[PDB]
């Protein structure tokens, strides 16, 4: 029907321009997402450079484990929250295979909703309000606070985020997170000076907050880029659907004209 065809075509046009607007907004946020990465990237990598140089390997003999996974509260990103979900699931499987008591923490409503059903017992704390605003160190400090004030001393841990590679490419990465006893007992830490359990504890906590901030600043850029690309694809899909509907509309329009003409000429030829 011509009228219902126009209705459906208007619906698809509406959501098509919606995704166009959302894509341009996502690109506008990818701007200032890629800028605030470079200083934050330098900062986070400078934090990690110690663990890298001293070459700490963590213990492979202990069980209590923490799994932090970074995502956002907004959807339409594409394969972001799914990727984090799959990585966290695979690693929970692998670790619980070795009987390691694993606990979970989710930065973002989406990852928490995706992992809460199948993984509810293995769960300590989640977080919301992440994704609307560009993340800042205050957020990471709050998260570190909440993680330390949890009554759960993780002997090892790992954070999983989406290392932003390019506007089209992102790699789900996983950084390690050691505990006080790890860095303390690490024999390669014997060459570091004025070191005792208190200083190492303070430095451990501060590096935890640092790496959470770094993961956040990477994941937000990755997510903005992914949302841009996904909305672009959705706009092209809706455009193709609009072309199909236009073909069908022209067909129905011709049919209606012919039918009305037949009605006229048959009502006139009966005289």
């Amino acid at each position: 029907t011509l009228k219902d065809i126009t209705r459906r075509l208007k619906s698809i046009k509406n959501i098509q321009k919606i995704t166009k607007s959302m894509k341009m907004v996502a690109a506008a946020k990818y701007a200032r997402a890629e800028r605030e990465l470079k200083p934050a990237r330098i900062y986070g990598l400078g934090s990690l450079a110690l663990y890298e140089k001293a070459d700490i390997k963590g213990p492979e003999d202990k069980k209590k484990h923490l799994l932090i996974g970074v995502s956002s509260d907004r959807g339409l990103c594409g394969a972001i929250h799914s990727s984090i979900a799959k990585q966290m699931k695979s690693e929970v499987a692998t670790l619980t295979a070795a009987g390691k008591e694993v606990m979970l923490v989710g930065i973002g409503d989406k990852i928490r909703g995706i992992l809460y059903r199948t993984h509810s017992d293995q769960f300590l704390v989640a977080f919301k309000e992440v994704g609307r605003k560009p993340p800042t160190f205050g957020d990471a400090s709050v998260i570190a606070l909440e993680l330390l004030n949890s009554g759960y001393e993780f002997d090892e841990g790992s954070i999983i985020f989406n290392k932003f590679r390019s506007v089209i490419s992102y790699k789900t990465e996983e950084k390690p997170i050691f505990s006080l006893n790890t860095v303390a007992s690490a024999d390669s830490m014997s060459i570091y000076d004025d070191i005792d359990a208190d200083v190492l504890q303070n430095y451990q906590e501060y590096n935890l907050a640092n790496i959470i901030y770094y993961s956040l600043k990477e994941s937000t850029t990755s997510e903005q880029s992914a949302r841009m690309t996904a909305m672009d694809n959705a706009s092209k899909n809706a455009s193709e659907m609009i072309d199909k509907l236009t073909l069908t509309f022209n067909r129905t329009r011709q049919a209606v004209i012919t039918k009305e003409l037949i009605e006229i000429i048959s009502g006139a030829a009966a005289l």
């Binding site: 995704t19 594409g78 394969a79 799914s82 995706i114 996904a230 959705a234 899909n237 659907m241």
Partner: protein, 155 residues
């Protein structure tokens, strides 16, 4: 006017559709347009009725999701919605069946699925008892036994 006039004269209608035959499904019956006067729980039994209605409902929900899935990707759905989509595609494939007279231009062996096997297979697919096999396992098989046998042959 001709088929729309014939509809009133029939006790059971089977409406083949081109949108389904072009999916490779055969027979191309439209599951959401075929009706029968004996699809009644007091005739075919409450079990058959519940199974048939569940199949129709899940296929109708997938048909409703069609446009979202087409435009806004597949991975923007709810987990329950992805469950229904997967199950509905499995049911779509399973509803197809090779014919003994269609083995001349297809090669496959024609099957004749008894009623009990059909009711059981659709009970099981509805209950998600096969959400691990690929949907491709159900395309053009006989009963559900051949479905799982193929799914094992898939590796």
């Amino acid at each position: 006017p001709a088929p729309a006039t014939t509809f009133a004269h029939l006790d059971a209608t089977t409406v083949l559709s081109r949108a389904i035959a072009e999916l490779g499904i055969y027979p191309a019956v439209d599951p959401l347009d075929s009706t029968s006067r004996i699809m009644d729980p007091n005739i075919v039994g409450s079990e058959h009725y519940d199974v048939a209605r569940g199949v129709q409902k899940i296929l109708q929900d997938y048909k409703s999701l069609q446009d979202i899935i087409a435009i806004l990707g597949m991975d923007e759905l709810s987990e329950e919605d992805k469950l229904t989509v997967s199950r509905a595609r499995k049911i779509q494939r399973f509803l197809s069946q090779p014919f003994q007279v269609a083995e001349v231009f297809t090669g496959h062996m024609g099957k004749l699925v008894p009623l009990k096997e059909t009711i059981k297979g659709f009970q099981q697919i509805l209950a998600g008892e096969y959400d691990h096999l690929p949907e491709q396992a159900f395309y053009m098989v006989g009963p559900i036994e051949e479905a799982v046998a193929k799914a094992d042959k898939l590796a």
